[PDB]
Structure formats: C-alpha cells, structure tokens
C-alpha cells in the first residue's frame, strides 16, 4: 500500500496537491434575488463542487484501495460535511460572511431570506469564527478534510472479511493523526499543547457532523417542496440518507 508508507511531509504534499479548485457561481449582483433563486444558485454550485470532490477523493491516500462499494458509502456519508468544512475554511478571513464563491459573499441577513436556512448559516459562521480564533492552518485543514472522508462512514459499513476493510482505514487515519502532530511539533508547540490542539481540532468534527445532519434535513425538505429543483447526482446523494 502506497498510503501506509508516506512520510508526514509527503502526506501533507499529497493532500495539498489534491486540493480541488474554488468554483464560481452564476450570481449576478446586478440582479436582486429571491429566497428560491439564491437557493438555485447555491444548488447549482454544490452540484459542480460534488463532481470535483469525487475526483479529489480518489487522490486521498488509501481511498483507492477500497472496493467501489466502500468508496460509494464513504462519500454518501461524508459529502455534505466535506462541502461544509471547505466552505467555512474559505470564509475564515471574512468575519460574519460566508464565501460560497469569490463572486458570492453572503452575510446572515441575506440567508434569513430563505426558510430555516439561517440556523445553518449561523452554525457555519460559528465554525469559521472558531477556525479564526484557533488560527487554523492550511496543512491542518487538508488533514481534517481527509479524516472526515475516511471516518464518517467507517462504523455504518458486514460478514467477516469487510472487517479488514475497516482496519486499513483505521491505519490510514492513524497516519493522518501522526501527520497533525508532526505539524504542531514543527510550529514549536510543547507536548501538552500538541495534545490539546489535536483535541480541539477533532472536537470540531463533531459540530461539522451536526451541521451536516441539519443541512440534510433542510435539503430533503426543499425537495418535498418542489420550489427549488435539485440536480440528479444530488437528489441521489440526498436519497442515500433518507
């Protein structure tokens, strides 16, 4: 396995290299908007990010070693968490605003404009604010993102052998943990500080899981409303949940 053999630095290089691009939206600031239309723009955007995400996943060390069946499961479970943490990351240096795209920077006042979306925006804002106070680093963020892909679906996968599918994943996660410590040690943190920051970073994943679940409930609900139309890939990802 190529993955279980990389060095901390090669791991970080690999992930930094695999970063998907930041996409543009069809937002036209000359046009005032509706709750529904702004939801169309965001839906169109997420659908395009998803395609990039899937090909990004292939480039995360160890992912390719799994069955197509296992790969599908992990992405079905993690997709919205991954979109969300990416969103909060790029919104990090824009206090009070969500940077969905370089040409689409929203504050909560405008998110209130749609139904029950404001609760999610505020959670997303809170996370960015948290990233900001922790002064999260780029190499840390890419580690976290891959932990989400590997971890989120690992307990919900099961006759006997697939049990070894789980053990490979846990070994990869362990490597990513080693990677995060390496980084913190480099930045001149005491042992106690490395441990504390490691915990701080991982606890954030709990809140991201929470946001994802809330978002999933909001998405399923949009659908039932047939106001905002969903893309086909995305209706599909949504359905893998309910």
């Amino acid at each position: 396995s190529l993955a279980l053999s990389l060095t901390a630095d090669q791991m970080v290089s690999a992930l930094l290299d695999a970063e998907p691009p930041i996409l543009y939206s069809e937002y036209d600031p000359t046009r005032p908007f509706s709750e529904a239309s702004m939801m169309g723009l965001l839906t169109n955007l997420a659908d395009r990010e998803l395609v990039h995400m899937i090909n990004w996943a292939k480039r995360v060390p160890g992912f390719v070693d799994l069955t197509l069946h296992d790969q599908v499961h992990l992405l079905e479970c993690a997709w919205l968490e991954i979109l969300m943490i990416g969103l909060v990351w790029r919104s990090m240096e824009h206090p009070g605003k969500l940077l969905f795209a370089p040409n689409l920077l929203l504050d909560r006042n405008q998110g209130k404009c749609v139904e029950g979306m404001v609760e999610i925006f505020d959670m997303l804002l809170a996370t960015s604010s948290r990233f900001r106070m922790m002064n999260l680093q780029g190499e840390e963020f890419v580690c976290l993102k891959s932990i989400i892909l590997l971890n989120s679906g690992v307990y919900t996968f099961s006759t006997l052998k697939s049990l070894e599918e789980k053990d490979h994943i846990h070994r990869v996660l362990d490597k990513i943990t080693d990677t995060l410590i390496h980084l913190m040690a480099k930045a001149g943190l005491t042992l106690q500080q490395q441990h504390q920051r490691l915990a701080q970073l991982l606890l954030i994943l709990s809140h991201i899981r929470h946001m994802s679940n809330k978002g999933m409930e909001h998405l399923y609900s949009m659908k039932c409303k047939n106001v905002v139309p969903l893309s086909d890939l995305l209706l599909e990802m949504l359905d893998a949940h309910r």
């Binding site: 899937i54 292939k58 599908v72 992405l75």
Partner: peptide, 9 residues
C-alpha cells in the same frame, strides 16, 4: 447511479 459512475470515471 451517478456517483458509482463518476468513481469509475
């Protein structure tokens, strides 16, 4: 099933 398809490329 679109995801399955994209993963196979």
């Amino acid at each position: 099933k679109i995801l399955h398809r994209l993963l196979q490329e």
